[PDB]
Design a protein around this ligand. Structure first.
Ligand SMILES: CCCCCCCCCCCCCC(=O)OC[C@H](COP(=O)(O)OCC(O)COP(=O)(O)OC[C@@H](COC(=O)CCCCCCCCCCCCC)OC(=O)CCCCCCCCCCCCC)OC(=O)CCCCCCCCCCCCC
Ligand SMILES: CCCCCCCCCCCCCC(=O)OC[C@H](COP(=O)(O)OCC(O)COP(=O)(O)OC[C@@H](COC(=O)CCCCCCCCCCCCC)OC(=O)CCCCCCCCCCCCC)OC(=O)CCCCCCCCCCCCC
Ligand code: BCL
Ligand code: BCL
Ligand SMILES: CC[C@H]1c2cc3[nH]c4c(c3C)C(=O)[C@H](C(=O)OC)c4c3nc(cc4[nH]c(cc(n2)[C@@H]1C)c(C(C)=O)c4C)[C@@H](C)[C@@H]3CCC(=O)OC/C=C(\C)CCC[C@H](C)CCC[C@H](C)CCCC(C)C
Ligand SMILES: CCCCCC/C=C\CCCCCCCC(=O)O[C@H](COC(=O)CCCCCCCCCCCCCCC)COP(=O)(O)OCCN
Ligand SMILES: COC(C)(C)C/C=C/C(C)=C/C=C/C(C=O)=C/C=C/C(C)=C/C=C/C=C(C)/C=C/C=C(\C)CC/C=C(C)/C=C/C=C(\C)C(=O)O
Ligand SMILES: COC(C)(C)C/C=C/C(C)=C/C=C/C(C=O)=C/C=C/C(C)=C/C=C/C=C(C)/C=C/C=C(\C)CC/C=C(C)/C=C/C=C(\C)C(=O)O
Ligand SMILES: COC(C)(C)C/C=C/C(C)=C/C=C/C(C=O)=C/C=C/C(C)=C/C=C/C=C(C)/C=C/C=C(\C)CC/C=C(C)/C=C/C=C(\C)C(=O)O
Ligand SMILES: COC(C)(C)C/C=C/C(C)=C/C=C/C(C=O)=C/C=C/C(C)=C/C=C/C=C(C)/C=C/C=C(\C)CC/C=C(C)/C=C/C=C(\C)C(=O)O
Ligand SMILES: CCCCCCCCCCCCO[C@@H]1O[C@H](CO)[C@@H](O[C@H]2O[C@H](CO)[C@@H](O)[C@H](O)[C@H]2O)[C@H](O)[C@H]1O
Lengths: 62, 73, 273, 99, 72, 39, 58, 180, 58, 58, 60, 39, 39, 60, 56, 58, 39, 39, 39
């Protein structure tokens, strides 16, 4: 049987894969405003590339 | 938000739908401080995930204790 | 690079020390005089941490351990192998954390913002300064500081706790824990409310301050308002760190027995002694 | 209490009706007379504005607010007269009149 | 420099929110009120609560749980 | 952005510094090897 | 090959290069200084026949 | 010139220098979001969110707070700028949003956001004048106008708040300089 | 094959690739330097038959 | 089945695939490297009959 | 049956399906790899008669 | 967005790259197998 | 972005540099194998 | 060679250089002062025949 | 070398230099003060042949 | 030398100086009070021959 | 603000006061050295 | 900032303050060496 | 900005200062090697 690999180690790497995926998601969200960046060399996106700028629909009132 | 509240920065929904100088200054402060920034919306996602992951990772650690690992040291 | 709206904001002014001399940016980062001092203390402190790892038994990130001196050295600098390196790194860390706070003030001044962020960070600096300066100084030896090591400082926390037999009974610690837990609850509620009005189900208009106030009102029974939840979040998060600093400074300098026997005053109130 | 605030806990209260001479009550009275006359002026300007634009339920409240501003002013004028009478009969009081 | 840490001037409104947004089934319990102390730090209105069926049952089940603990 | 003439001019210095640095490092390695060879 | 400096600003590349080589140089020196064989501050005056060697197989 | 600023020099990361008056042009801390929507912010029920209290009869000052109307406003140079004559209230979350100040000179009325007003002793007593540390009494004359006297657009809210925000740097030439 | 550079900006890919190769090379070297058999700083002068070997089956 | 590239942007899918393969390969290599039988950096030179095997039924 | 794709966007479903299958496959492999009987990396070369078996009824 | 032509052209390279990858993996597994089989 | 002609020019450098790097790494593995074989 | 100062502002290259040298100089001194052989404050008066030399254990 | 002050206006950097020197002097004194050989507060009267040497 | 006061505001310099000297005096007194030889509140009446001295070289 | 004349006046006091302080401190050291010398 | 003639005049004082400081330090080191040599 | 003549003038000082500093460091190492050589 596997001596070194155990269920706590497996679960921890499952979390790390999820968590880095989450940080990527959050950094895409962070870039909906102010991007692409202005620079002397032209537009810059950084990484990851930002999600598009989002339009909001207001209500018709009552 | 308190630091930009005089510029209307606490009206966070309008700063999200209709970005004002209070949002821009908030983004620039953190960008100039630590080299990256959120938005007025996305800071609330960072907030939401940090709080949620506190108890979610907690529960996993409890479930592993005494079932998979009996001596964590 | 710059955000699409940024260039307009990059004026001179708002510095505390250097005037125009250091009043420039490096990529996204504002420099300033305290940017220069930050990078000095960060680089020196980091390279001394790497030297501590080099002369220790392993490079394993979790096991690196730069320990303070023995208590017998009192308030002197020990030999560098014997804890003096920890003492130099502690001076660098104080220099870095202080420089970071003052740099944030220069940035806030340049943007016309209030000084809230520098002071809120002062709550964390206070807690660090309590652990490595104020409490060791009141106990009379720098060796009372915590070791710099990702898990070895957790061994320190464990042993300091059991120095008082049952640290959960520390009354300031109960308050500090209550603030940390209340803060995490409040953060989840505030984060959820803003996202729920800005990201309603598909085919629903964007929400309003009225809806989040109505929802918040029947959650807690009262409406806190937009400024109120940010005041509360700042109060809870910074208040946790302040009560943390209190709970550790009373342990040892002012109280020495087990913490459970501190509660003897409550049992002896004369209405029920 | 808005004016003395925390000092009302220690019994400093320079708003209370006073009929003997008191330089502290006279000081408070002179400050509050100016503020309340400005406040009456603003109240009747606001009535004139809201009458001009004609909104009936707002005209009602603007008149009610103006009446309250006049009444609050009249209390300070009464305080001013008491102190001014006491000034004339009391040695070492002010030479400049109250009200 | 004003720190914006507490509110020196509150304003009352005589009609009030607290009558909810359009909400359908269940009932709004109580009438809205203002606390001057709540108004110092945050918004002043202390006011109506919604339960519905799930809120009522939650309080009944929870009260029994609290009673059993306290009585023991 | 640079003219291609400016890129050409910069590239000459960049190659020359890289070569110089590699030479100094090569001497440094052979001194280290002579004193305490790692294979 | 110079058109690499049209794809990349030399001002940025030299900052990246100085940063990279600074870190790499400090890494290697501290790794060697942590070793037994190359702890040259304590043992640099030992000859090659006198310096440590890590344990061989049986 | 139709550009409000120029680089201090050619190097990357150098500051910009305003070509005119920064408080008026909107450079540095005096900047506003220049593309912000020029429409009133609305309540849930679709009425104007921020209005002079004169035009909403449901509102009043709470018991136990000072009434700011009739108080003198003391500017950064300790001169009287004017007198408060009206309050503007946020109707979605009951607040005073702006004081409206009758200027002592030239007889404009200008708006003054409540986040720029300090009460004398942190409000603990006195409560008999308003202190405005950000701008001098002369600079009050140039506070951006509101194109109607009964509503304010999101763009105008940004212009006005930006004008006082710029005063912490530009009200006196010394405020840009270091403390040493 | 060259149309891949119409899908991806070559300036971005080259930065990505150098980042990947730098990390990967550092990881592989540190794995080997952690090992017994390839602790080359301490034991690199051992002959191939003197270098450590992990245990066999009994 | 090429309409999958109309269904999904190939620039995103191909980065997803590269990331998936990178993670999966690293997982498998580190799992094997943590075993006894396939700890190849320490024991790769052992012959197939000398390599470790886990215990049988008794 | 095909009108299921009118209820559900296939672009969401295929991602959700691939996610489920990848999770499920990894869960089953690691559950087996943790077992005695099927720890195939260390014991895969054992014949089926000599692979481990959980203990039978103990006559307790 | 791709034309269906570009999609169908790209698919050819993708199938070819996948095949090249599976070929290399197959050789690698057979090298691994003949050095230390796992069944 | 690039023209197809610029993309073709870059591809030449990219493939050449990639194959060059693999050749240098091939010599590194030749030297490492001759010093201390891992199978 | 001098056009490096058209690429970079000399006012801040000199700041970054001086700071680097100060950090480097302090590190090397603290490293030497940590050693036994070069702990010069405590042992600087020892002649080179008395100065410490580190060795591995013989373990014969 | 006087042209240095045209880069670095002295009124903005004298408090920098003096702050650097004061901290550096304090560090050096505290390093000496708790060495065995130079702990002059406790042992300054000994004279050089009696003062400690930290030999191995 | 007096033109130094045209660079710096004496009102601020005198505060910074007095603060510095107050801290410095307080530190030097505390260093002496914490010593053995100069802990004068307890041992101040001892003659200079009687006062403590640190250990010599053995 | 300041002038050559104003700076000269202040400098006269500042120098005098500093030197006066150092004189008094030197007498304190003389007294301390007489009581318990440190070398 | 200052002119070159100002910078020359300031430099004259700064150099002399530096020499003065170094002279005091040099005497301090030689007193210390006389008391307790570090080599 | 600064002109090529200013850059050239600055470069001459900058190279000279570097080389002077390196010379001073060389003599410091000569002294240290005489006191206690490290190889
Ligand atoms: C367990 C619970 C944890 C809980 C705590 C969790 C903390 C999570 C938050 C921190 C991570 C986010 C940091 C961040 O986003 O910074 C912005 C930066 C660049 O921003 P950009 O907008 O995309 O691009 C700007 C660029 O286009 C133009 O800028 P400019 O031309 O002016 O300057 C050049 C850039 C060059 O970039 C860099 O130098 C990158 C520096 C290092 C990036 C982060 C590496 C990983 C962490 C640090 C490891 C080295 C640390 C010593 O210069 C800059 O932009 C510098 C500004 C960014 C400085 C970021 C400093 C972050 C420090 C984080 C410390 C974490 C400590 C744990 O982003 C990036 O470079 C890419 C970041 C990608 C997300 C990170 C997660 C990746 C997960 C793994 C996925 C697979 C591999 C990528
Ligand atoms: C890690 C700890 C935890 C903390 C962990 C978290 C760390 C967070 C930081 C992470 C890195 C952030 C990087 C960043 O933000 O960069 C912004 C910058 C801006 O790009 P740009 O705006 O487009 O371009 C700027 C450039 O065009 C103009 O620069 P400027 O003129 O303003 O400033 C000059 C620079 C430095 O100049 C040079 O480096 C070149 C000097 C001439 C070289 C000549 C050849 C030499 C050959 C050898 C000959 C030799 C013989 C002669 O510096 C300044 O003046 C600015 C002030 C610097 C900061 C103040 C320093 C104060 C003093 C203390 C210094 C202590 C020592 C550092 O971006 C770039 O330039 C491109 C990206 C550069 C990446 C740099 C980092 C690479 C690290 C790689 C490590 C990889 C490890 C796996
Ligand atoms: C000697 C003591 C042990 C220790 C033992 C434990 C144990 C045991 C646990 C933790 C857990 C936690 N510990 Mg620990 N912990 C120690 C040291 C520390 C230190 C420190 C500085 O030393 C810190 C900061 C922490 C921090 C933490 C948290 C991160 C974590 C709890 C998260 C949370 O939100 O919980 C607070 C949130 C909740 C409990 C969720 C509650 C939600 C429910 C729905 C609320 C119901 C309310 C109900 C309606 C009302 C009831 C009324 C009454 C019936 C009257 N521990 C040491 C090592 N710690 C937990 C964890 O996750 O571990 C992995 C845990 O179980
Ligand atoms: C007032 C203008 C000058 C001044 C003018 C003089 C004159 C004139 C004489 C001295 C003399 C002396 N001064 Mg002087 N002196 C000044 C400032 C100082 C300072 C200082 C910290 O600033 C110090 C330490 C001294 C110290 C000294 C001594 C070296 C010496 C005599 C002993 C002494 O200390 O008397 C105590 C004095 C002080 C602690 C401070 C000064 C007090 C007052 C202002 C002067 C007293 C002079 C004394 C009564 C002698 C009178 C001489 C007859 C009139 C002929 N002076 C100011 C700046 N000084 C005398 C000398 O050369 O003797 C050898 C002398 O004739
Ligand atoms: C993300 C992690 C953090 C988290 C989040 C969180 N907690 C939450 C929420 C969120 C997002 C909620 O929305 C929910 C909530 O309602 O918040 C106000 C909640 C909540 N978090 C709670 C507590 C809590 N959270 C904690 C922690 C955490 N909460 C984490 C730090 C802790 C800790 C640290 O120990 C506690 C104690 C509650 C306040 C609340 C859930 C309330 C609940 O479920 O109540 C059930 C009901 C009862 C126990 C019964 C009460 C009985 C009455 C007193 C009886 C009165 C008489 C009655 C009228 C009789 C019936 C008659 C009928 C006819 C009417
Ligand atoms: C919001 C959603 C966030 C999701 C984050 C997920 C993160 C963490 C939790 C994962 C579940 C952990 C289960 C732990 C139990 C475990 O491990 O028990 C193992 C069997 O193995 C197993 O059950 C294998 C378990 C594999 C877990 C799933 C991995 C694959 C999916 C990854 C998805 C990542 C992205 C999302 C037994 O262990 P033992 O020590 O007794 O064995 C030896 C006995 N002698
Ligand atoms: C512990 O063991 C571990 C660490 C784990 C093992 C692993 C190690 C690993 C993975 C190592 C990898 C190393 C590596 C990989 O490639 C290393 C690569 C190194 C390289 C490439 C170095 C290059 C240096 C180049 C230099 C110095 C250039 C200097 C240029 C100069 C001086 C001129 C500047 C220009 C001028 C003056 C022009 C101005 C005129 C202008 C502008 C005009 O005229 O216009
Ligand atoms: C035991 O440890 C564990 C970790 C467990 C073991 C396992 C490890 C594993 C799984 C490893 C996997 C590795 C791997 C997998 O794929 C590795 C893949 C590596 C790869 C792809 C390397 C590719 C390198 C390519 C290079 C260097 C290209 C250089 C190009 C150059 C120089 C040209 C630059 C352009 C120019 C000059 C044009 C300018 C002109 C222009 C633009 C003009 O003119 O326009
Ligand atoms: C293990 O580590 C450890 C143990 C620590 C070991 C390692 C230690 C190390 C590495 C130490 C390094 C030390 C160092 C390195 O450089 C130290 C460098 C020191 C230096 C540079 C000292 C310089 C001092 C200069 C002074 C004082 C000048 C004063 C000038 C004055 C007063 C005049 C002011 C001007 C006037 C009056 C004119 C106004 C006129 C005007 C305005 C007009 O006329 O207009
Ligand atoms: C523990 O062991 C570990 C630490 C691990 C081992 C490893 C160590 C390692 C890796 C070390 C690396 C070291 C290194 C690497 O390169 C070191 C490189 C050092 C360098 C480059 C030093 C350069 C110094 C340059 C100086 C001092 C310049 C002075 C200039 C002056 C005085 C004049 C300025 C001009 C003026 C005033 C004119 C204005 C005129 C104007 C404006 C006009 O006229 O306009
Ligand atoms: C502050 C006084 C108490 C502490 C004295 C310290 C001990 C030294 C005593 C010296 C005598 C008194 O100190 C001496 O006073 C005179 C006059 O006030 C100062 O004189 C100073 O101010 C006068 C004002 O008229 C200027 O004209 C003159 O140019 C300037 O130097 C001297 O600079 C100072 O040296």
């Amino acid at each position: 049987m596997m001596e070194y690999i155990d269920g706590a180690q497996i679960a921890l790497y499952a979390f790390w894969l999820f968590f880095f995926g989450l940080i990527i998601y959050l950094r895409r969200e962070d870039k909906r405003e102010g991007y692409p960046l202005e620079s002397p060399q032209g537009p810059r996106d950084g990484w990851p590339k930002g999600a598009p700028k989002k339009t909001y629909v207001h209500r018709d009132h009552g | 938000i308190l630091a930009v509240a005089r510029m209307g920065g606490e009206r966070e929904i309008e700063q999200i739908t209709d970005r004002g100088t209070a949002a821009e200054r908030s983004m620039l402060f953190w960008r100039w401080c630590m080299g990256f920034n959120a938005t007025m919306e996305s800071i609330h996602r960072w907030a939401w995930w940090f709080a949620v992951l506190t108890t979610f990772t907690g529960g996993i650690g409890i479930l592993l204790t005494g079932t998979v690992v009996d001596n964590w040291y | 690079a710059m955000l699409s709206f940024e260039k307009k904001y990059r004026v001179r002014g708002g510095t505390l020390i250097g005037g125009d001399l250091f009043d420039f940016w490096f990529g996204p980062f504002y420099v300033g005089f305290f940017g220069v001092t930050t990078i000095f203390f960060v680089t020196l402190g980091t390279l001394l941490c790497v030297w501590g790892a080099a002369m220790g038994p392993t490079w394993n990130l979790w096991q690196i351990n730069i320990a303070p001196p023995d208590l017998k050295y009192g308030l002197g600098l020990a030999p560098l192998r014997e804890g003096g390196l920890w003492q130099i790194i502690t001076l660098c860390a104080l220099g870095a954390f202080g420089s970071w706070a003052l740099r944030q003030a220069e940035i806030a001044r340049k943007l016309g913002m209030g000084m809230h962020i520098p002071w809120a960070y002062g709550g964390a600096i206070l807690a660090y300064t309590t652990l490595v300066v104020i409490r060791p100084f009141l106990l009379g030896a720098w060796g009372h500081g915590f070791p710099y090591g990702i898990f070895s400082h957790l061994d320190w926390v464990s042993n300091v706790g059991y120095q008082y037999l049952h640290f959960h009974y520390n009354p300031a610690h109960m308050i500090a824990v209550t603030f940390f837990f209340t803060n995490c609850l409040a953060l989840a509620m505030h984060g959820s409310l803003i996202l729920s009005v800005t990201n309603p189900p598909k085919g629903t208009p964007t929400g309003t301050s009225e809806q989040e106030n109505v929802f918040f009102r029947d959650l807690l029974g009262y409406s806190i308002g937009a400024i109120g939840i940010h005041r509360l979040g700042l109060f809870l998060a910074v208040g946790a760190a302040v009560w943390s600093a209190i709970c550790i400074v009373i342990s040892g300098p002012f109280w020495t027995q087990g913490w459970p026997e501190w509660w003897n005053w409550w049992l002896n109130l004369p209405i029920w002694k | 209490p808005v004016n003395d605030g925390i000092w009302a806990w220690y019994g400093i209260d320079d708003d209370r009706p006073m009929a003997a001479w008191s330089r502290f009550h006279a000081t408070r009275c002179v400050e509050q007379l100016a503020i309340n006359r400005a406040r009456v002026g603003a109240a009747e300007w606001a009535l004139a504005d809201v009458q001009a634009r004609g909104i009936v339920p707002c005209i009602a409240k603007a008149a009610a607010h103006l009446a309250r501003a006049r009444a609050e002013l009249a209390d300070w004028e009464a305080q001013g007269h008491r102190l001014e009478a006491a000034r004339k009969v009391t040695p070492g009081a002010w030479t400049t009149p109250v009200i | 420099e004003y720190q914006n840490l507490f509110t020196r001037v509150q304003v009352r409104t005589v009609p009030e929110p607290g009558i909810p947004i359009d909400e359908s089934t269940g009932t709004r319990y109580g009438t809205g009120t203002f606390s001057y102390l709540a108004g110092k730090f945050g918004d002043a209105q202390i006011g109506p609560i919604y339960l519905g069926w799930a809120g009522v049952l939650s309080l009944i089940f929870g009260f029994i749980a609290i009673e059993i603990i306290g009585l023991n | 952005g640079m003219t291609e003439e400016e890129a050409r001019r910069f590239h000459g210095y960049m190659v020359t510094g890289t070569l110089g640095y590699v030479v100094v490092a090569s001497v440094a390695h052979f001194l280290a090897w002579s004193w305490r060879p790692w294979f | 090959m110079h058109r690499i400096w049209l794809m990349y600003d030399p001002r940025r590349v030299m900052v990246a290069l100085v940063g990279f080589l600074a870190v790499l140089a400090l890494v290697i020196h501290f790794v060697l200084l942590s070793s037994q064989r190359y702890s040259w501050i304590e043992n640099g005056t030992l000859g090659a026949d006198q310096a440590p060697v890590g344990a061989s197989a049986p | 010139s139709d550009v409000k600023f120029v680089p201090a020099d050619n190097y990357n990361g150098s500051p910009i220098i305003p070509t005119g008056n920064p408080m008026i042009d909107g450079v540095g801390p005096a900047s506003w979001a220049e593309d912000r929507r020029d429409e009133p912010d609305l309540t849930y029920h679709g009425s104007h969110k921020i209005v002079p209290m004169r035009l909403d009869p449901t509102f009043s000052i709470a018991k136990g707070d000072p009434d700011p109307r009739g108080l003198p406003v003391i500017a950064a140079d300790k001169q009287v700028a004017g007198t408060v004559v009206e309050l503007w209230v946020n109707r979605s979350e009951p607040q005073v949003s702006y004081y409206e100040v009758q200027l002592a000179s030239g007889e404009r009325r200008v708006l003054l956001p409540t986040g720029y007003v300090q009460w004398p002793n942190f409000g603990l007593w006195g409560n008999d004048k308003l202190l405005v540390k950000s701008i001098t009494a002369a600079q009050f004359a140039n506070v951006p106008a509101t194109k109607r006297d009964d509503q304010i657009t999101l763009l105008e809210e940004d212009k006005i708040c930006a004008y006082y925000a710029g005063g912490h740097m530009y009200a006196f030439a010394e405020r840009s300089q270091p403390i040493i």
